[PDB]
Amino acid sequence: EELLDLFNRQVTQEFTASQVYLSASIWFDQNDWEGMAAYMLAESAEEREHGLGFVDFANKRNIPIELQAVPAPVSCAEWSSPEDVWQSILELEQANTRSLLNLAEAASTCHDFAVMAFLNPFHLQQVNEEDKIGSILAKVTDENRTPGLLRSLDVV
Amino acid sequence: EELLDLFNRQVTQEFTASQVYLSASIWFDQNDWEGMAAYMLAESAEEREHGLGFVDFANKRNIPIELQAVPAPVSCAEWSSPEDVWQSILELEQANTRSLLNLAEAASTCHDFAVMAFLNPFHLQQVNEEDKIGSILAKVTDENRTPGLLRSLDVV
Amino acid sequence: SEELLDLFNRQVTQEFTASQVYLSASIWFDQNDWEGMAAYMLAESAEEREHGLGFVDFANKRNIPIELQAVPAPVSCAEWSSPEDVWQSILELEQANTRSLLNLAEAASTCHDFAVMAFLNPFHLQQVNEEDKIGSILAKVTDENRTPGLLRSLDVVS
Amino acid sequence: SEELLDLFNRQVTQEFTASQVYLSASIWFDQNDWEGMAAYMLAESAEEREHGLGFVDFANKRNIPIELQAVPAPVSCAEWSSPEDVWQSILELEQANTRSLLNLAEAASTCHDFAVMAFLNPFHLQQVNEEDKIGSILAKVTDENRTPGLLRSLDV
Amino acid sequence: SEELLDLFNRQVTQEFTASQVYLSASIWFDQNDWEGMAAYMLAESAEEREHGLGFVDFANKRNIPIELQAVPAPVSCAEWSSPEDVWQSILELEQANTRSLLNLAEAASTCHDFAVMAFLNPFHLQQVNEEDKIGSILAKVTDENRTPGLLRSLDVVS
Amino acid sequence: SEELLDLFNRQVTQEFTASQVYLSASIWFDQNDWEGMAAYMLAESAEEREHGLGFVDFANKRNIPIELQAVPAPVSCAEWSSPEDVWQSILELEQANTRSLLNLAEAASTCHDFAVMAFLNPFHLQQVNEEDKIGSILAKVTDENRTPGLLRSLDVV
Numbered sequence: 001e002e003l004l005d006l007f008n009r010q011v012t013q014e015f016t017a018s019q020v021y022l023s024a025s026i027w028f029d030q031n032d033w034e035g036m037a038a039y040m041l042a043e044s045a046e047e048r049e050h051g052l053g054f055v056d057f058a059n060k061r062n063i064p065i066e067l068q069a070v071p072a073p074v075s076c077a078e079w080s081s082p083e084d085v086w087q088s089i090l091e092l093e094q095a096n097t098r099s100l101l102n103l104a105e106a107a108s109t110c111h112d113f114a115v116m117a118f119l120n121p122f123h124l125q126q127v128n129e130e131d132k133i134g135s136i137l138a139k140v141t142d143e144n145r146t147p148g149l150l151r152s153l154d155v156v
Numbered sequence: 157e158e159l160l161d162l163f164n165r166q167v168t169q170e171f172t173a174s175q176v177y178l179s180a181s182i183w184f185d186q187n188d189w190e191g192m193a194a195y196m197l198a199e200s201a202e203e204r205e206h207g208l209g210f211v212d213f214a215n216k217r218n219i220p221i222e223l224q225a226v227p228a229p230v231s232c233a234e235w236s237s238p239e240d241v242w243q244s245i246l247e248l249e250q251a252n253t254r255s256l257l258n259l260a261e262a263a264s265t266c267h268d269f270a271v272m273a274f275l276n277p278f279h280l281q282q283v284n285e286e287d288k289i290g291s292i293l294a295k296v297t298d299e300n301r302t303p304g305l306l307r308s309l310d311v312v
Numbered sequence: 313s314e315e316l317l318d319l320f321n322r323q324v325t326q327e328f329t330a331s332q333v334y335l336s337a338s339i340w341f342d343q344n345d346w347e348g349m350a351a352y353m354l355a356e357s358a359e360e361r362e363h364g365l366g367f368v369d370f371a372n373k374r375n376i377p378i379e380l381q382a383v384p385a386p387v388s389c390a391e392w393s394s395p396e397d398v399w400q401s402i403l404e405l406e407q408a409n410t411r412s413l414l415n416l417a418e419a420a421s422t423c424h425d426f427a428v429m430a431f432l433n434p435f436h437l438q439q440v441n442e443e444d445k446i447g448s449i450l451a452k453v454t455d456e457n458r459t460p461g462l463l464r465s466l467d468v469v470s
Numbered sequence: 471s472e473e474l475l476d477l478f479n480r481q482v483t484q485e486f487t488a489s490q491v492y493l494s495a496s497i498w499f500d501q502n503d504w505e506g507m508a509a510y511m512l513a514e515s516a517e518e519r520e521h522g523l524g525f526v527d528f529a530n531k532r533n534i535p536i537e538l539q540a541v542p543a544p545v546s547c548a549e550w551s552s553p554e555d556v557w558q559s560i561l562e563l564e565q566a567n568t569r570s571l572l573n574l575a576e577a578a579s580t581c582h583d584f585a586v587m588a589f590l591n592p593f594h595l596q597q598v599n600e601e602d603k604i605g606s607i608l609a610k611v612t613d614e615n616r617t618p619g620l621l622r623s624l625d626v
Numbered sequence: 627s628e629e630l631l632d633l634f635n636r637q638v639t640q641e642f643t644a645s646q647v648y649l650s651a652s653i654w655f656d657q658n659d660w661e662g663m664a665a666y667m668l669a670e671s672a673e674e675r676e677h678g679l680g681f682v683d684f685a686n687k688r689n690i691p692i693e694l695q696a697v698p699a700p701v702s703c704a705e706w707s708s709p710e711d712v713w714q715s716i717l718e719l720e721q722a723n724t725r726s727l728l729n730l731a732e733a734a735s736t737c738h739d740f741a742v743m744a745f746l747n748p749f750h751l752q753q754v755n756e757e758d759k760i761g762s763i764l765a766k767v768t769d770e771n772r773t774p775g776l777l778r779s780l781d782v783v784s
Numbered sequence: 785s786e787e788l789l790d791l792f793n794r795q796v797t798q799e800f801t802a803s804q805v806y807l808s809a810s811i812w813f814d815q816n817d818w819e820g821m822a823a824y825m826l827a828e829s830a831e832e833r834e835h836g837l838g839f840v841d842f843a844n845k846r847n848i849p850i851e852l853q854a855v856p857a858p859v860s861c862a863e864w865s866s867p868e869d870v871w872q873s874i875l876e877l878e879q880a881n882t883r884s885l886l887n888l889a890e891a892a893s894t895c896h897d898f899a900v901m902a903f904l905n906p907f908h909l910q911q912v913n914e915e916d917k918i919g920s921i922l923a924k925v926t927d928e929n930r931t932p933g934l935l936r937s938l939d940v941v
């Protein structure tokens with residue numbers, strides 16, 4: 001069952017993204033970027049809510065779920081500026097999107113209309129999310145060209 | 157036209173489900189399961205609302221509807237206990253799901269994007285409906301293992 | 313007696329039949345862009361179903377076993393060509409709902425079933441009002457339809 | 471593909487085109503003292519422009535490059551002689567808008583562009599409603615205009 | 627007289643043309659992540675359209691025939707490389723807007739068309755305010771863009 | 785505070801591990817139509833995650849470097865076959881949560897780390913409440929399950 005495997009992989013991906021957001025929050029806080037840290041923290045909670053949403057749907061639809069390990073976040077070992085963090089987060093969101101499109105493709109092949117329906121708001125949410133991050137990343141890489149200026153904008 | 161047939165049959169299945177629910181409420185009332193009876197009666201009204209929503213849509217989309225007979229319910233002749241009723245209601249909801257998927261499959265083939273959009277909330281509702289019925293039947297089957305205990309579910 | 317039981321079941325069937333026929337009238341009206349008349353018939357469809365459900369509840373309480381019968385496909389829509397045809401069939405439908413109720417009352421009266429007769433009284437009075445109201449809409453329709461477009465101009469209104 | 475970006479641009483144009491066509495109908499109605507019908511077309515003109523703006527916003531978010539095309543002048547108003555002529559042109563405009571959205575949907579479908587398909591669903595459902603409503607208005611106009619002066623009653 | 631009637635008809639095209647150019651500026655700003663400037667341009671796009679609708683409504687009342695013309699494709703977007711280029715084009719747009727209203731008022735004046743001159747007064751005062759507002763934004767923009775990153779930091783603000 | 789830093793990290797791991805085990809319990813309950821027990825475990829999963837975040841936040845303020853470890857795949861769920869088995873595994877999870885807090889407090893006490901010890905105090909007390917509550921639900925579960933169907937009637941509660 002490709003569809004079942006992909007659905008389980010989607011849950012893991014949501015919780016993986018939740019932990020990576022959490023890792024970003026930690027790096028920001030340790031480096032005194034409290035406004036960015038709070039943003040990443042809120043995003044960590046929202047990603048977990050997505051995973052929980054997929055778990056609930058799967059239970060109702062009899063798609064057997066088994067929780068996999070949530071891997072330790074790795075990018076954080078090499079972040080050295082807010083630009084590096086935001087870039088990893090963009091890449092994370094790009095991967096979340098492909099991971100949802102993969103799942104949709106599998107559902108489409110199986111003619112699974114209920115799964116396709118369930119995924120629609122997540123596809124639209126990902127469009128908004130990639131846009132929002134790509135646009136914070138533009139602003140960060142523009143303001144970091146003047147020493148200190150980026151800080152002055154972490155002022156939430 | 158296959159799409160136009162499958163759309164009419166859908167209206168028929170919603171109204172037929174409405175009557176089957178009403179037959180189940182009657183069987184429970186006659187047998188003093190007033191709680192289960194009120195539940196079935198609410199579901200009857202709700203299936204009827206789905207049929208009317210299909211009819212309204214078909215009217216707007218110029219999908220000619222012609223109302224078919226609602227057949228005499230017949231499972232009621234055979235029900236001996238709440239478990240038999242709830243088992244039939246599960247198979248009814250499984251037939252409602254099947255009927256929706258048949259119609260979606262045909263809308264897909266025809267690239268009828270509007271019909272497919274219209275069906276999405278019904279797909280997601282059926283997921284919840286089957287889960288809910290499956291779960292009630294689980295409880296009934298467990299509680300009916302001790303004499304008189306199921307009579308406690310009915311007071312809820 | 314089984315005669316009473318029979319007529320009580322028939323009454324439930326007639327209410328649900330009327331509910332379906334009212335629904336077919338809504339559909340014809342809607343398809344032909346008479347949204348006001350369509351809304352009226354849709355409300356009546358829901359009300360007739362409510363009456364059937366009231367009879368079922370009463371029967372269950374009184375130990376009158378109900379067995380639900382088929383509700384036939386409404387077939388008059390095949391031949392309706394104007395609002396007047398539709399309202400004419402609805403007036404005939406209400407004349408039939410009045411008949412099945414007076415059949416039932418006749419049998420209850422024979423049987424000295426005071427409880428059934430008491431239960432039927434508000435339904436007799438409601439049919440009086442229903443027949444009056446449908447007869448009166450039909451007279452308005454039939455008058456207004458003598459001038460092209462005039463009927464439409466009032467669906468919109470009313 | 472390329473055809474998908476293209477058709478997405480084309481959609482924005484079709485929305486703004488239809489906005490102008492509605493404004494031209496308002497003008498003919500006003501000029502000929504049908505103020506109620508004029509109010510109605512004017513509100514629809516605003517709404518079509520809002521639809522184009524919604525497509526522009528989504529395209530921006532999804533990095534579909536939009537480039538605004540000229541908005542063609544409306545052509546039908548030179549030949550309108552009566553309200554029925556106007557409402558018939560507006561029915562055709564809406565049928566044109568529906569075909570336009572289905573074209574776009576067909577392209578997204580081939581591309582497996584699930585985000586674009588989710589985004590279009592409320593528009594497919596809205597167009598069903600719009601065509602029904604204009605159809606219904608046209609029916610009434612065509613019936614009432616059979617008696618001299620009677621249509622002026624509708625205008626309210 | 628025909629001079630005036632044509633210039634009035636054509637003011638409607640100029641309002642909608644300005645609407646579409648504002649919209650094009652909004653798009654450029656959104657695609658380049660200046661959401662704050664994009665929202666300002668989008669609001670002005672709606673307001674320019676409302677002005678053209680105001681002209682159309684007045685012409686209908688005064689029996690000035692309106693024939694709606696093509697709204698030209700905006701063309702400065704292809705050339706814009708920075709917010710300063712966009713605000714500069716928007717300034718030229720408003721100065722054109724102002725000149726087209728002054729030409730209209732001049733024709734009305736020649737025609738002794740007191741109604742048209744009255745109708746135009748609040749637009750002349752509005753153009754004064756808009757040109758000032760855009761001149762001012764363009765001055766801020768050109769000053770802040772002297773330090774890398776600084777202009778960003780104010781889109782975010784205002 | 786080498787020992788102390790590593791124990792403080794492990795505590796974060798244990799909170800998030802417990803969060804996932806609660807979630808796995810919620811899933812087993814939902815799949816087996818025990819909605820009320822499932823709700824309870826979901827509620828607990830959220831609250832374990834919150835504890836994890838409180839430890840992380842304190843660590844960040846106190847400059848204890850946190851590196852987030854893998855959260856392992858829950859395993860007990862492969863063996864559960866009745867509610868009693870789930871609640872017994874949850875009681876053992878809470879006993880292990882109490883144990884890791886107590887390793888932490890011992891290391892802090894050794895280091896005379898007064899702020900860390902102050903920070904743990906409400907968690908100590910919470911763990912008392914939590915072990916008591918889970919012990920008490922397990923006792924009720926084990927009792928009601930002696931009559932067929934009886935437990936079900938009280939998830940319905």
Ligand SMILES: [Fe+3]
Nearest residue numbers: 014047050096
């Ligand atoms: Fe997500």
Ligand SMILES: [Fe+3]
Nearest residue numbers: 170203206252
């Ligand atoms: Fe249904």
Ligand SMILES: [Fe+3]
Nearest residue numbers: 327360363409
């Ligand atoms: Fe009745």
Ligand SMILES: [Fe+3]
Nearest residue numbers: 485518521567
């Ligand atoms: Fe539109």
Ligand SMILES: [Fe+3]
Nearest residue numbers: 641674677723
């Ligand atoms: Fe203007």
Ligand SMILES: [Fe+3]
Nearest residue numbers: 799832835881
């Ligand atoms: Fe804990």
